[PDB]
């Protein structure tokens, strides 16, 4: 029932920085983790990165090594993704997303099974 909304999206030159960012449309209660997948041409979706929305704990891919920041804005229902060093490998439509978790055992997001998706947005990078 989150409704996600992504913008940021577009071109960008290898090496060079984007931040994408992410509103649920009403409130995101403490229970979720808010999280950024990807989908690359002609390749599966992958996770990106999450965050527990009231924890604030994170986790990343391998694929990030570091580049990337996922963060959070909990007065604004807003989740960011920060992506530093950009790639070709990058070029690919970031999917927010939100999976709620009331019965979690600890404050460590998931990296999959999420259930609420936004539309995407494209983020093409430049050789």
């Known amino acids: 029932a989150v409704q996600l909304q992504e913008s940021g999206g577009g071109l960008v030159q290898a090496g060079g920085s984007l931040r994408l960012s992410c509103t649920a449309s009403?409130?995101?209660?403490?229970?979720?983790?808010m999280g950024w997948f990807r989908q690359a041409p002609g390749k599966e979706r992958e996770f990106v990165a999450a965050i527990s929305w009231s924890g604030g704990t994170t986790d990343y891919a391998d694929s990030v090594k570091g580049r990337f920041a996922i963060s959070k804005d909990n007065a604004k229902n807003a989740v960011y993704l920060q992506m530093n060093s950009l790639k070709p490998e990058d070029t690919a439509v970031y999917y927010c997303a939100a999976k709620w978790r009331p019965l979690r055992y600890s404050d460590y997001p998931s990296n999959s099974d999420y259930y609420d998706w936004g539309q995407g947005t494209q983020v093409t990078v430049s050789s």
């Open positions: 009403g409130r995101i209660s403490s229970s979720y983790d």
